[PDB]
């Protein structure tokens, strides 16, 4: 569990993966592909590129569509609990 105070445009990282758009063949997980410099994620350390996301305010992300994961990450107040 990595805690983050979301910033102006977001958590400060990008994602790929999800059912229908398998980042890795046969895998629907959501993976962190980029960490924006100076974003909240970066500054706070705990998360890095390549990490598999598990949950957001324990909405499990194990196997959901890419868009569901996006929304799940947009609709979580300034306070956020990660994986």
């Amino acid at each position: 569990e990595i805690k983050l105070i979301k910033g102006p445009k977001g958590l400060g990282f990008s994602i790929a993966g999800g059912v229908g758009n398998q980042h890795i063949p046969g895998d629907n997980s959501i993976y962190v592909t980029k960490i924006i410099e100076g974003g909240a994620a970066h500054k706070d350390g705990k998360l890095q590129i390549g990490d598999k996301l598990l949950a957001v305010n324990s909405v499990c992300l194990e196997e959901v569509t890419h868009e569901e994961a996006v929304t799940a990450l947009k609709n979580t107040s300034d306070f956020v609990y990660l994986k």
Partner: peptide, 6 residues
């Protein structure tokens, strides 16, 4: 192919 800024 979808990669998104969050």
């Amino acid at each position: 192919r979808r990669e998104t800024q969050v």
